[PDB]
Write a protein that binds this DNA or RNA. Structure first.
Ligand SMILES: Nc1ncnc2c1ncn2[C@@H]1O[C@H](COS(=O)(=O)NC(=O)[C@@H](N)CCC(=O)O)[C@@H](O)[C@H]1O
Length: 463
RNA sequence: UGGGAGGUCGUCUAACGGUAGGACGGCGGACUCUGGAUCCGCUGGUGGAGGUUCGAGUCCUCCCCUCCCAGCCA
């Protein structure tokens, strides 16, 4: 009888703040074997959409969040749109009017900012004309409390609160009413949402017992925030899952973070969502707001790029290119595997991984100013690039140890300083001053590609 | 202000009432080469006050701040 869901809202895209709350119900529904449902909350006709109401599922899907019921697929307890159900929220909203719980509020047409009176009677002689009309829920005295699964005994004073509209003039449910209705008809066992709703729960409870139903289990976990410590959205830089996927951040690496920022770890903070099911701590999560951190995220991501199998990585890297603009060249899979096995221990993102292996692939790579302005332009940099092609020319064996021999046997030949000899060969074959092990670089780049890049630099030296 | 929720290094997080520790960042070594990366190291916090105590992040009280609900937003 376990059925937890996630009620999104079509408004641009989804960020880590929302995804994290989604990841929870996902795992939970899996640890207990319950059903996970997807319910798009688009009751706000003003900010309604479809595009932004689609980019959400794709991302979640990319996050590895599979859902049982949803609008994208089938679903008996549907429809799954807080808009394609204006036939249900109707009769129910009118049933509350019976028990004197909901009264038709008649508004003034002359001014869209004036109220007339209160009445349970149906204002046919007003709505038919033009006078906007809604439906409010009368709040009676008392204390509407509940047992939060994280906050505990949450007691509230209905007195401090009052009649709140539950039906927009355009015959559209607001939210507190839309939730209660779909949180019962869809038979939801547990409701695990953010924390900004912890204040709305009371308003909802009064609706449950109103219809004579039985509210489910409510729990409100911390909220991922930004720098100013405000509820994460988009104004906090770029915390949209869509963004990360662009920058080249793995999925398993990001997931391992959301379940690390707020939700703790029973050992090594580095892991995956799989090996964390049976060891899921529904309550042992977080209790306070958690600021998002790119640095910790990128750090965690970079590591996953080293633990996972070599094959696993390349696959994801391939898919990334298709997502982003510029694509990958055409090279030997075994050669690509090597260069991809040498540059993976330097970059912490797929973007940085591509912008570093480019020289290993394409040969029309440029030369960063640093290299030229610092070492290359040095009058005593050409003579060093001379023996660089000579010694190597003779080298019958082209491996690390061997290539390692030549290099060191140069910096100590009066030719030039230690680093000077290394940075010249480096940028000569990579075009950058920051690349993988020079012993690996010169190695993986075979013997031919090397000599060419040595010549190239030479011919260019002449400004 | 009304009502809720929460405060430990810059950030995420440990501490039977009894050592404020561990990580990311940052700064520094090392890697008989580069450094985003790799091993370690290094400072850095109890939101601020009174009191109960041999002693309090931990217990009581006052003060301060932060986020949410006080929309025909969700
Ligand atoms: N800055 C933030 N940090 C961390 N969590 C955040 C968040 N902003 C929203 N959330 C949480 O993400 C989920 C979806 O957000 S949302 O698309 O706006 N939808 C809604 O708020 C409501 N339709 C949810 C209905 C319900 O569960 O009762 C909701 O659970 C919401 O509480």
């Amino acid at each position: 009888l376990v059925r937890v869901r996630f009620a999104p809202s079509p408004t641009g895209h989804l960020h880590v703040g929302g995804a994290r709350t989604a990841l929870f119900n996902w795992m939970f529904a899996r640890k207990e074997g319950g059903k996970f449902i997807l319910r798009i909350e688009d009751t706000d006709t003003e900010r309604s959409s479809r595009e932004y109401e689609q980019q959400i599922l794709e991302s979640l899907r990319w996050c590895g969040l599979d859902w049982d019921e949803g609008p994208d697929i089938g679903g008996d307890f549907g429809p799954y749109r807080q808009s394609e159900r204006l036939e249900i929220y109707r009769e129910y909203a009118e049933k509350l009017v019976e028990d004197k719980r909901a009264y038709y509020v008649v508004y003034d047409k002359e001014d869209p900012s004036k109220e007339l009176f209160t009445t349970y009677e149906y204002p046919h002689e007003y709505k038919e004309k033009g006078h906007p009309v809604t439906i409010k829920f009368k709040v009676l005295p008392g204390k509407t409390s509940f047992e939060d699964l994280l906050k505990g005994y949450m007691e509230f004073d209905n007195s401090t609160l009052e009649d709140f509209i539950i039906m927009k003039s355009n015959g559209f449910p607001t939210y507190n009413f839309a939730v209660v209705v779909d949180d019962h008809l869809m038979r939801i066992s547990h409701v695990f949402r953010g924390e900004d709703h912890l204040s709305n729960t009371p308003k909802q409870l009064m609706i449950y017992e109103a219809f004579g139903w039985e509210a489910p289990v409510f729990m409100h976990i911390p909220l991922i925030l930004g720098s100013d410590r405000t509820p994460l959205s988009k104004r906090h830089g770029a915390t949209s899952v869509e963004h990360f996927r662009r920058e080249g951040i793995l999925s398993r690496a990001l997931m391992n973070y959301l379940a690390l920022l707020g939700w703790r770890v029973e050992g090594d903070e580095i892991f995956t969502i799989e090996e964390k099911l049976q060891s899921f701590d529904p309550k042992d999560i977080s209790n306070k707001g958690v600021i998002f951190d790119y640095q910790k995220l990128e750090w965690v991501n970079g590591k996953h790029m080293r633990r996972i199998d070599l094959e696993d990585l390349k696959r994801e890297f391939i898919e990334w290119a298709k997502y982003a603009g510029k694509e990958i060249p055409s090279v030997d899979e075994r050669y690509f595997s090597e260069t991809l096995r040498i540059c993976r221990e330097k970059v912490n993102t797929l973007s940085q991984l591509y912008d570093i292996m480019y020289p290993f692939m394409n040969d029309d790579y440029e030369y960063e100013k640093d290299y030229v302005e610092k070492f290359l332009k040095r009058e005593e940099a050409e003579r060093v690039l001379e023996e660089a092609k000579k010694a190597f020319k003779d080298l019958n064996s082209w491996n690390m140890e061997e290539i390692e021999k030549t290099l060191r046997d140069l910096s100590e030949k009066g030719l030039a300083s230690k680093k000077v000899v290394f940075q010249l060969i480096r940028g000569a074959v990579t075009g950058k001053l920051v690349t993988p092990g020079l012993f690996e670089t010169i190695e993986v780049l075979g013997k031919e590609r090397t000599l060419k890049r040595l010549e190239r630099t030479l011919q260019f030296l002449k400004k």
